[PDB]
Amino acid sequence: DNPRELQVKYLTTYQKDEEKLSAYVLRLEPLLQKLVQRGAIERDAVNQARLDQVIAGAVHKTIRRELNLPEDGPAPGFLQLLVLIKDYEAAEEEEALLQAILEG
16 A cells, blocks of 8 residues: 555566566556655656566566567667567467477
């Protein structure tokens, strides 16, 4: 309920085994915006905070590279990050289709 408790819950929210990364980011977003409301995070840090937790919580332990995002660079906005993830998930689906076919 209080800001620290909200922070702990956000930081310990992790991507589920069979959850799409895009669904994961969508699930995180309300929690992040609530943290902004309660003063636990400043507006100007939101994008970085978002990216950080995606990186921390993702099943893919090197997702920052898969999305071609470099450290130190500026954090993408919400919609930009979602589009990067959509493109990534499309490519992953292509790889899965190929594996299923070759397995014929």
